């Protein structure tokens, strides 16, 4: 009984820690990816804003 | 199954219509209709014909003025060939990778490097080109500061080298990664595991140096003492002093009672035990 | 308690992620339509009893409690993985879409300067 | 480990909320620009 | 610190430049009709002045500059950036005075909802509710703002988002010595989470809260209600909540104060308890 | 091999083309320089690549562009960060100034974090690194990002306690713990921070530490229930009795109970040095 329960608990905690480390690595990768995506989208929105403003002022000057 | 025949006939009719239209300013429409025909074949689930149609559509797109969409079409054609003659898939993925690197997007290039390496090693038995691809991916990722994927590639190549008896590179990679993890507050708990594996690999070179290596690891990382893995390693090291098979066999059985050891770990354990 | 709070807030984050994916698809479609229009413009026991005293008894039960709770913890932990795992894929997908978006506007800008000259 | 993960997940949540706000502004201005372009093209014809 | 003085001086000089530019803009309009360029340019000057004042740590000056920029740009019939400038002014005033922030955010919400931008309006409503709760003891304003934001989010098809607003409203109602509303919200949230695969585990706790707040209205009706909960979520028996509730009921049945106190102390010893639970327990002990 | 030499030759040709085109006298030169810098990076030539990126950024800024010029400056800085810390520092400072002018204060705080990180790890620098951390924490606090601000403040407090007096560390730990008291997630760590404060006082003198721990116990009763309260009481008794043997016994027992991070042990040894 002692061995059964002790090794069962050891296996449970080991699997818990394994999936937790896997999830932490995945979460770090996700954090890097989302930081990149935020940078990319901020740059894209700034670029499109500048382009549309430039087009508006150009058409106003020409019309 | 008449549905497959119907889809094949519809895709062939669409391809014929595309060919007549292109044969009849028309470059853009020709490329678009060819791409639609390739997608129709892909929908029909004819991997060979769909891949051929999509690759000729990619070529015609290259005939059209565009690079980014051209690279997207190259990578999509490589994915389509994935389930076809692997040489064409590999070459098209090389072309897409080169185009992406030329555009400066190194991260996607290294992701495609990993993809090609994995598909090549899983399908074909040769490993050297896959290792080279993984190394190239790690180089780009580290140059771009993508630590996670570069470290994953380094770990993969280290594992392959250890499997290939080139334990020196594997142990060096594991040691550097583990000390870097020690530097960072995060992932340190897992890094010791790498040391354990590395320590096992270390014994493969010789026996007497195992004690010195474990002492160096202990003084470098004192908390590594708490690891039951280190206790098991030292018990087995002491047991190996005598030509007895019962000791280490019972030890590995008891440890396996806790968690199921990886197949590679069992293989290397048997290798060390026998000789 | 911390596990439960993390799981619930991760569920909220996943719903938000789906919402922002829908928003990104809306952005893609609207920008494509605008560009086209603009182009068209142109377990038995746990402790042995060294002494037959009450101090031992509760130990077993105590230990048992923790054991049982760990069981529960298992599902909790596993559950978390699932959620985040799914979210992983979603993020990768949006990347490609985002790329296309910017790429298009790039040439669009050039067009806005190419025809005027 | 749980405490560290909790803090990291909260930071990720704030990151996601900020990205949501940026995307909301982006879509708002995209809709406004779409309306302006539609009006301009319709009236210019 | 020379940095602070230098930043203040340059910000003041740029703000004076903006003021003189707006002043002679009217003269130019009357004389030669330069156009609308002068107003927009003054708008960017005011925004830069506000940013530089913020970098100088003078929040009041930044807020004032944001208000002037908002007014000047709204005169050009551009309401979106006007509301953005009101939001900036409210953020600036947050450190100096938390009252002007309220009206600035109200105006921003009105502008945003004029165009159907209900997301920003609801977020600003939540922010104003939080500001009211932190500053003023008048929980009614926070409740109104929170319920308005929750209604907007429900109209936005945002699931699992207004639920937090409903939970906050329930907590406020329970704190305000009104129980039926909080009990109803708690039970509704719990039964909703029942069908949620993840929130179901937490759902049970919500029931307890309802029961807890249902124990202030009257003892027996709460006890009976537990059965209604107990049948709904039989796993609630496995939790310590059933044991705690039944033991408290048994102790109160015979005025056993010592048992009540000992159980509360032991439960706190297991883990720290929240202020809400302590207040509920204290109020129940009055009987 | 062939690849590096060919890519280097192509980059040289691109630089020559851009130089002659500018001599003909504008953006096309900027894209040519950017492509040449990408060519150098592909060649793995860390040198002459960050310089090319900086030159392209300056050329594009020549026409008042800031966004993409700032991005290219940051790229040059990151490229030179591994090769030459000074060039990366200059590029990061330029990016910080440009984004502060444009209002991207979050980017400025991130660049300050990067500068402080390189100063602590790459260079031998503590004062400027501490100043950069403080500036980044203030910027993040202004941008409603308090987690990184608290982390940087805790790091600065640790550094100050290590090299300077503990008064700054005392204030930082006390304020952080008080803020975390009401915080539900950070409450448990709050006690730890409070605990640290006591240690910071014990190094200075026993009376101040005693008064501080009494104040914390009265204000925050939970700290009493933790093992840290008993450990601090025992250490206080050992110091008061001027019997370093008891201090040593308590330290060994506490180390045996749980592992140490090599910092608490160092502080306790320093305290043992002043016990006399």
């Amino acid at each position: 009984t002692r061995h059964s329960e002790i090794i069962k608990l050891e296996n449970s905690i080991r699997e818990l820690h394994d999936m937790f480390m896997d999830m932490a690595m995945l979460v770090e990768s996700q954090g890097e990816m989302i930081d990149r995506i935020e940078y990319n989208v901020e740059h894209a929105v700034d670029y499109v804003e500048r382009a549309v403003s430039d087009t508006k002022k150009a058409v106003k000057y020409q019309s | 199954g008449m549905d497959t025949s119907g889809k094949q006939a519809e895709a062939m009719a669409l391809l014929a219509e595309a060919e007549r239209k292109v044969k009849n300013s028309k470059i853009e429409e020709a490329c678009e209709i060819y791409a639609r025909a390739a997608n129709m074949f892909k929908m029909a689930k004819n991997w060979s014909a769909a891949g051929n149609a999509f690759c000729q559509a990619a070529q015609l797109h290259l005939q059209l003025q565009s690079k980014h969409d051209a690279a997207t079409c190259f990578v999509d054609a490589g994915n389509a060939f994935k389930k076809a003659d692997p040489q064409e898939a590999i070459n098209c993925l090389m072309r897409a990778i080169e185009i992406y690197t030329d555009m400066g997007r190194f991260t996607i290039a290294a992701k495609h490097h990993i993809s090609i390496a994995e598909i090549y090693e899983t399908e074909l038995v040769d490993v050297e080109k896959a290792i080279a691809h993984y190394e190239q991916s790690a180089d780009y990722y580290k140059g771009e500061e993508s630590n996670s994927s570069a470290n994953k590639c380094l770990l993969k190549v280290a594992g392959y080298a250890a499997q290939l008896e080139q334990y020196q590179k594997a142990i060096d990679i594991y040691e550097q990664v583990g000390t870097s993890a020690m530097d960072s507050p995060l992932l340190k708990y897992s890094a010791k595991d790498y040391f354990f594996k590395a320590a096992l690999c270390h014994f493969c070179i010789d026996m007497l140096n195992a004690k010195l290596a474990v002492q160096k690891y202990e003084e470098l990382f004192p908390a590594f003492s708490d690891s039951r893995e280190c206790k098991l390693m030292k018990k087995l090291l002491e047991a190996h002093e005598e030509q007895n098979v019962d000791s280490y066999t019972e030890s590995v059985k008891e440890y396996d009672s806790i968690s199921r050891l990886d197949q590679w770990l069992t293989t290397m354990l048997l290798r060390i035990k026998k000789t | 308690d911390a596990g439960i709070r993390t799981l619930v807030m991760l569920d909220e984050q996943g719903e938000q992620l789906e919402r922002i994916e829908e928003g990104m698809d809306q952005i893609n479609k609207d920008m494509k339509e605008a560009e086209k229009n603009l182009t068209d413009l142109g377990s038995g026991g746990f402790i042995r009893r060294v002494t037959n005293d009450a101090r031992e008894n509760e130990m077993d039960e105590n230990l048992e409690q923790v054991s049982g709770i760990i069981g529960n913890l298992r599902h909790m932990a596993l559950d978390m993985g699932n959620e985040i795992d799914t979210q992983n894929r979603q993020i990768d997908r949006i990347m490609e879409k985002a790329d296309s978006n910017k790429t298009r506007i790039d040439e669009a800008n050039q067009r806005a300067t190419k025809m005027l000259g």
Side-chain angles (χ1 to χ4, degrees), chain A, chain B, chain C:
Chain A
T1 54
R2 193 91 199 102
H3 64 111
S4 61
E5 66 194 5
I6 290 300
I7 296 89
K8 165 263 287 181
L9 200 68
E10 289 289 328
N11 176 10
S12 288
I13 188 166
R14 165 63 51 162
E15 296 297 328
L16 286 162
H17 270 96
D18 296 332
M19 65 170 145
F20 286 138
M21 296 326 196
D22 191 10
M23 281 315 327
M25 167 82 185
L26 180 41
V27 163
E28 287 290 344
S29 298
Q30 182 177 0
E32 190 275 331
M33 297 153 58
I34 190 166
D35 196 345
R36 197 189 303 178
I37 207 72
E38 186 185 3
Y39 184 23
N40 187 343
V41 65
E42 191 71 1
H43 192 68
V45 62
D46 299 318
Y47 178 82
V48 64
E49 172 55 48
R50 189 249 297 282
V52 64
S53 181
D54 296 335
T55 295
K56 284 198 296 297
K57 60 176 71 174
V59 298
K60 286 161 182 187
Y61 293 174
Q62 183 166 6
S63 69
Chain B
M2 72 292 291
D3 57 328
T4 187
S5 179
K7 297 309 301 181
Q8 287 313 127
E10 189 66 28
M12 294 296 172
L14 178 51
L15 186 139
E17 187 257 329
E19 290 170 330
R20 67 131 280 171
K21 289 287 184 184
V22 61
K23 287 287 287 190
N24 297 139
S25 61
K26 295 173 286 196
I27 70 183
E28 198 274 334
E29 287 83 2
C31 287
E32 294 290 358
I33 197 160
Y34 269 113
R36 296 296 83 70
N39 309 138
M40 192 49 187
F41 281 107
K42 185 263 171 187
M43 283 217 180
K45 173 157 157 56
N46 200 278
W47 311 102
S48 70
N52 180 19
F54 194 74
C55 75
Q56 58 80 29
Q59 283 153 59
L60 275 175
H61 186 103
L62 264 292
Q63 196 267 326
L64 192 83
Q65 62 90 31
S66 163
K67 289 193 287 294
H68 191 306
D69 280 330
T72 58
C73 191
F74 281 166
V75 60
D76 285 329
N79 286 321
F81 284 111
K82 191 70 73 74
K83 331 293 183 313
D85 49 357
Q87 183 46 288
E88 307 311 325
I90 293 165
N91 295 137
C92 196
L93 276 171
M94 291 325 148
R95 291 193 297 274
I97 280 177
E98 195 280 330
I99 295 287
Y100 283 145
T101 53
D102 192 11
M103 309 146 78
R105 284 94 160 283
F106 289 86
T107 67
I108 64 184
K111 181 183 286 186
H112 296 112
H113 286 107
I114 295 162
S115 68
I116 57 168
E118 176 54 291
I119 66 173
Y120 171 54
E121 66 187 3
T122 189
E123 184 147 300
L124 270 56
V125 187
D126 187 81
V127 63
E128 298 297 329
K129 324 209 281 175
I131 298 304
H133 296 130
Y134 279 116
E135 291 165 349
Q136 189 63 49
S137 181
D139 190 1
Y140 291 167
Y141 271 130
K142 201 178 289 296
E144 298 297 329
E145 322 318 330
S146 185
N147 187 0
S148 60
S149 63
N151 267 349
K152 286 202 309 205
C153 290
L154 288 171
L155 265 71
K156 182 41 69 177
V157 298
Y160 265 101
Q163 164 271 338
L164 194 50
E165 305 291 327
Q166 187 62 255
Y167 305 109
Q168 182 54 256
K169 184 186 285 191
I171 184 167
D172 302 321
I173 296 296
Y174 290 145
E175 198 272 359
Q176 67 183 3
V177 168
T179 184
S180 180
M182 294 314 99
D183 189 358
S184 308
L186 195 143
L187 193 73
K188 68 189 181 71
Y189 318 100
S190 301
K192 61 182 191 186
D193 206 24
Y194 305 151
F195 281 171
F196 162 66
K197 299 177 183 292
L200 290 176
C201 290
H202 170 59
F203 193 109
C204 293
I205 198 57
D206 48 18
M207 154 177 197
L208 58 90
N209 190 358
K211 203 59 77 183
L212 260 180
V214 64
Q215 152 55 11
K216 293 150 141 173
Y217 279 118
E218 280 292 12
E219 64 85 19
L220 173 54
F221 185 21
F224 182 76
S225 187
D226 67 15
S227 283
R228 171 171 70 230
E229 286 81 1
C230 193
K231 310 208 319 307
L232 176 138
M233 275 184 295
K234 64 173 75 173
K235 75 183 184 178
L236 267 63
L237 172 55
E238 296 297 328
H240 184 282
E241 176 44 51
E242 294 77 3
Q243 184 178 2
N244 59 342
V245 170
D246 46 34
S247 47
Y248 66 69
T249 313
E250 155 53 16
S251 311
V252 298
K253 220 180 292 190
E254 186 39 46
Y255 192 81
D256 183 14
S257 187
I258 290 284
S259 61
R260 165 52 210 161
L261 281 76
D262 196 359
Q263 169 56 14
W264 168 71
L265 293 174
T266 49
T267 305
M268 67 203 301
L269 278 158
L270 193 142
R271 188 185 304 163
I272 178 175
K273 288 152 192 299
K274 290 316 304 292
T275 317
Chain C
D1 300 332
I4 294 299
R5 301 141 48 193
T6 301
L7 263 174
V8 301
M9 62 180 288
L10 288 170
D11 161 34
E12 171 57 293
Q13 289 193 23
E15 305 211 343
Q16 187 288 331
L17 278 173
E18 175 40 45
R19 270 225 294 284
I20 179 58
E21 175 170 5
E22 188 276 331
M24 211 55 258
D25 279 348
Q26 166 173 1
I27 287 294
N28 200 11
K29 193 47 51 194
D30 301 327
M31 183 278 287
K32 279 187 184 293
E33 195 273 334
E35 174 145 21
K36 285 142 207 200
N37 197 26
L38 194 147
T39 48
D40 298 329
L41 185 143
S43 287
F46 269 94
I47 295 293
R48 184 161 80 141
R49 296 187 185 286
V50 62
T51 66
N52 305 301
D53 196 292
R55 288 192 312 292
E56 287 73 342
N57 301 91
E58 71 286 40
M59 295 298 102
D60 195 327
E61 284 96 7
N62 298 140
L63 272 72
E64 190 277 331
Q65 298 182 31
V66 164
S67 178
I69 302 290
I70 283 158
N72 305 318
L73 292 187
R74 183 68 171 276
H75 312 155
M76 267 66 69
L78 183 43
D79 299 332
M80 289 181 182
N82 293 0
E83 186 81 19
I84 301 96
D85 201 356
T86 59
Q87 279 173 42
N88 186 3
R89 252 166 287 282
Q90 178 172 184
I91 297 169
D92 188 358
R93 296 191 284 94
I94 60 158
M95 171 45 158
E96 290 185 354
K97 302 153 221 162
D99 198 333
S100 83
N101 169 7
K102 71 173 191 295
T103 298
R104 293 185 61 79
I105 193 73
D106 300 335
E107 61 86 20
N109 172 28
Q110 187 202 270
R111 196 223 60 71
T113 59
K114 191 100 164 142
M115 173 37 49
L116 272 49

